[PDB]
Design a protein around this ligand. Structure first.
Ligand code: NA
Length: 135
């Protein structure tokens, strides 16, 4: 359902490009900013470069009137290092479960990543802002 939703905002706060890769929603839809009825393909974001101080926004929700939520993953990768993984990201805003999940994994000590805004207890996962910086 549309009540299961997440907004992921990637903000590059450093001086080196970061890149989005392997964006895949396993449950639900990706949709346009502020319009859950406008479903969009992950190719609108796949491989996109986020330049210094730029931002990129992904919106995902459950499908309308579906007893199912939104679940997906994506990578941030380093376009100056052979698209080496920076971090791996997983989101889940389930239907009928009170625990939402936002999990960052992987390791790359040249990069630092900070996120906030998530809601883990009941309802939608919320609007998560992810700051990236190459050290
Ligand atoms: Na949810």
């Amino acid at each position: 359902a549309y009540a299961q939703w997440v907004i992921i905002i990637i903000h590059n706060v450093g001086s080196q490009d970061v890149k989005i890769k392997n964006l895949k929603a396993s449950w639900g839809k990706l949709h346009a900013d502020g319009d859950k009825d406008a479903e969009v393909s992950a190719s609108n974001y796949e491989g996109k470069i986020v330049k210094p101080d730029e931002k990129l926004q992904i919106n995902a929700s459950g499908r309308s009137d579906a007893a199912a939520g939104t679940t997906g993953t994506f990578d941030l990768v380093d376009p100056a290092d052979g698209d080496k993984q920076v971090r791996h990201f997983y989101w889940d805003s389930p239907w009928g479960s009170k625990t939402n999940t936002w999990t960052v994994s992987g390791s790359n000590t040249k990069w630092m990543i900070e996120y906030s805004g998530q809601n883990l207890d009941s309802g939608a996962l919320g609007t998560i802002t992810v700051d990236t910086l190459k050290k």
